[PDB]
Amino acid sequence: MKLIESNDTVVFPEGVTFTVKNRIVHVTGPRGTIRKDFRHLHMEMERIGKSTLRVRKWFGVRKELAAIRTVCSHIKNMIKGVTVGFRYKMRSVYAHFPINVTLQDGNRTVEIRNFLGEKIVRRVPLPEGVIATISTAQKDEIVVEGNDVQFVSQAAARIQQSTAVKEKDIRKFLDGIYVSEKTTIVPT
RNA sequence: AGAUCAAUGGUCUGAAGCUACCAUUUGAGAGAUUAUAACUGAACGCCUCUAAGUUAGAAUCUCGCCUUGUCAAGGCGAAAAU
Helix, strand or coil, X not given: CCEEEEEEEEECXXXXXXXXXXXXXXXXXXXXXXXXXXXXXXXXXXXXXCCEEEEEEEEECHHHHHHHHHHHHXXXXXXXXXXXXXEEEEEEECCCCCCEEEXXXXXXXXXXXXXXXXXXXXXEECCCCEEEEECCCCCCEEEEEECCHHHHHHHHHHHHHHCCCCCCCCCCCCCEEEEEEEECCCCC
């Protein structure tokens, strides 16, 4: 069945603006602006009012209708990123070897050393708009920060998957850098 | 003394050329991705690597490097003398 009409709306808080057109959104807030392209989905996105953005699908099938709330969630994450940003805190877990984490290339590359005692150096470049920080207060804590949740979480996952154990069962060789918390920059 | 013949008379050494892992020299890079592990994220107000969208990804695959390139819309240029 093709449902005639199905829509969902996103309401923007104060101090944020969106200016959507042609299925491209340009959210902007205190922490800068995020531009997102949604042209891979054929829905009508419009401004209904002064701070409400409606995403609507005409005659959609189950799979297409599944993407309305996906797009709305993406725009909500855009709002959150431009207001309070995203910060992923990761913890280093090790049995014997301290996992040494440093930043190089103008703080654009994360270098991991001594993971499980290996002499190889693991290098993770950071995407544009994402910064990293080694916590001086809390030991063995890395923090990845930025506006765009996609890129922040992608960098965090790159770091987490970089430290993988090989040829040893992972059920107790649990060393590695694991995302311990997903929170915001500004205390919410 | 010089040489000849014995279908290469025979023995020793034997350059040159040819030749031996029996000597010596040289043999390497990207791209898209598979399985897989993940990100964001609905469907299904929760979850979820998946549905849309995103990451990393290999003796595989394609290309590079390397060999041929008398190629029938007679494959296509530059340039010299005619």
